[PDB]
């Protein structure tokens, strides 16, 4: 609902519109909170921020995709990951926000 501030990155549940946000410089717990984990999301990253997602817990095994701006889940299904594969980040389980 509320747009990400400049130094924040958010994912937003497609089902509920509830937002999960982190300031630049922070990461999630081992898993995202129970109220969002593994739900389908869109990305809403603030103007100075980049959202890093994993389809696994704990930002693990280089299973990490990069997202800037506003990204819809349909565009998150075959994304080049740090591990060299094209992964589906539309239902992420962990997250980090950095400066773009």
């Amino acid at each position: 609902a509320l747009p990400a501030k400049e130094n924040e990155g958010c994912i937003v549940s497609v089902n509920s519109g509830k937002r999960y946000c982190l300031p630049v410089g922070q990461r999630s717990g081992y898993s995202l909170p129970d109220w969002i984990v593994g739900q389908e999301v869109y990305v809403d990253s603030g103007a100075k921020a980049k959202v890093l997602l994993s389809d696994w817990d704990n930002l693990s095994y280089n299973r990490i995709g990069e997202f800037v701006g506003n990204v819809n889940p349909a565009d998150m299904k075959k994304v080049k990951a740090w591990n060299g594969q094209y992964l589906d980040f539309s239902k992420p389980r962990s997250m980090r926000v950095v400066y773009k």
């Binding site: 081992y30 696994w56 817990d57 704990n58 930002l59 693990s60 095994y61 280089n62």
Partner: peptide
């Protein structure tokens, strides 16, 4: 090497 990992279910 210095990648994060997960635990199998416990």
């Amino acid at each position: 090497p210095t990648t994060s990992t997960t635990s199998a279910p416990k």
